[PDB]
Amino acid sequence: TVVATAQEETKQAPGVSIITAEDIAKRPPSNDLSQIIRTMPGVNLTGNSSSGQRGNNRQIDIRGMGPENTLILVDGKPVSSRNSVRYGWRGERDSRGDTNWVPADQVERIEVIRGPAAARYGNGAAGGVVNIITKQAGAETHGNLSVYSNFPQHKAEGASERMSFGLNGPLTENLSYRVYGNIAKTDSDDWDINAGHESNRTGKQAGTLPAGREGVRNKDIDGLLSWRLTPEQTLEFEAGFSRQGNIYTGDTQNTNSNNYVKQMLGHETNRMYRETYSVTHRGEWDFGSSLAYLQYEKTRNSRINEGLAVGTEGIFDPNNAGFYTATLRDLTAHGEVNLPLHLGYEQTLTLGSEWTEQKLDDPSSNTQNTEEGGSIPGLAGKNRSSSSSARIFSLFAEDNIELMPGTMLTPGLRWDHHDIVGDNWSPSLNLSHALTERVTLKAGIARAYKAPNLYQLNPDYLLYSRGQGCYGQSTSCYLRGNDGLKAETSVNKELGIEYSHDGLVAGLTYFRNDYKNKIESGLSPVDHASGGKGDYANAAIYQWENVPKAVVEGLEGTLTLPLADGLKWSNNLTYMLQSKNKETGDVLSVTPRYTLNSMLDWQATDDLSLQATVTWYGKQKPKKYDYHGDRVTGSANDQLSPYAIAGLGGTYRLSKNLSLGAGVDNLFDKRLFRAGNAQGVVGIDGAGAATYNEPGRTFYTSLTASF
């Protein structure tokens, strides 16, 4: 018996779930993998912002920490592409997230690491980590061709189709390849899907609509070559090219319109190019193991020009038609060695480092002039730089120690130096303790780290308001980036007990995060500008600021029953006890109060597999207060009732080479419609928690040819 690395040991911690390729095949998503990831315990499909802005662009949220705090990996390497899309006043981004980069049918598995076992992954892992692992080459040449198509009951809702392929195996003696390609379309919902369901709209804004889901068109291709240089050294080269164009269906920040909007309904209004290049060295040695990689990610965000303020705010700019391009260049270097240490206790020490650079060039975001609200000393009113960057060097040590058989202790320390923010120390401890052969106690506590994002950190990043979004006042203000921000830290702990024997599993876990210095728009003026025009002159100057304390707290439960040899009933239950910003007393992240996922899995024959699913969501309650900090009144208090979603499907194995699947999601056709943002603006009432579309009954087919 030799001990696994701390990285691998802590994948059995209470806060880890694994989604397999088999799981994905039985219950396939339309396109974005968030659809299947979201059904793990402690995981929500949530908007980026509590405002409800861009509220249909829902993403993976871990334990109510918000999708910003979900670090997404592909084959262990970070995806930062959504950082090319401007972060607004309310933490809103016009971005679908980073779970759409890999086609579902070329995924081997997905590792969902929540809470204390995630902290080790460093910057961005305060909520957790989602690591998408691709299917890799073997010793024979293998390959596949996978098609999926779905069929909404209601034609106003967007259909999806998808075709992908894999091919891999040995070219020469030392040389092997793996390639995948993928073509996909999730159509947008129709412009008027939410008509009849919208928030009350008056005057100039009469006839406006909050938008349904934005469509997407994917083109993805990857190529990996794996070169066995010696018996102890493998070198991998990998390139990836992914293109995502939208299909625009009327989405604007505040759900207002103009004719430039109406004109672009059904068109491409944003397109994302992601280019990835990585070189990876793996060593298998007499003493242990080695892994080192370099990844360069180039993200290009091309979209139609919008305004930052004054009623060109968050909508296509009719005076400045055309597109701009923001470019993100993200370079990540990593090295580590793994050391089985024999004497004393048989443990495994991991020693490593990491370096990252992020360069952002965004010509649209830093362009707010100071004509109206007055000039701000130290900030040029015009021609401010597009460019921003930050760097983080990291050291770490982790040790996985068998204290005595059945008991493992996993301490780890990560140190990080951010070139602007300064140093961070992230202590880590996870452990597992067998109480009997059937029952285990597992605990964890660690301090995760999230660096400020480049919009929050940039003193050239300026937003302006005539008064509507100003906290504690109704007169005009500025919101300014702040390069002396502290980084966010979160002390995340979990305690879990689990019974496990002959496929019966019963478990319960408690979690709590003490979330420190969450970066958010300031509450009090730190200055006032000078000059400007009329009543707007001498605007208050707010900054991006660190919120002292926030908390989330809840329970994750699991119950898996073997009803018969070919029949399994799997259940998870998550219950949210707290999610609060302790400064404003407001909500941190809007999640269902609970989520109960149930699956009935029947191996009906050798070649036939049938599945039933039910998911019960609890109540959703919106923000209590507006941008001013004042108590919200009217339909901005609206809450979503609890509801369920049921599904059925199967897979038929024609042979070892061909499988087909069919089924239906949302069997009882429960639909919800986006009515607006949380709170209103002039002419447009709020909609509270009614900020997204739940799709109705949707039939599906799939076919996988493989060898």
Numbering used by the authors: 15 to 721
Can you quote the paper on this entry?
PfeA has the same two domains (22-stranded β-barrel and N-terminal plug) common to the TBDTs.
We constructed four mutants R480A, Q482A, G324V and R480A-Q482A (double mutant) to validate the observed recognition site. These structures were essentially identical to that of the parent protein, which confirmed that the mutations did not affect the folding of the protein. The same titration was carried out with G324V and R480A-Q482A, in both these mutants no binding was detected. A R480A-Q482A double mutant and a more radical G324V mutant have the same structure as the native protein, and did not show any detectable binding to Fe3+-enterobactin (ITC experiments, size-exclusion chromatography and crystallography). These results support the genuine nature of the binding site.
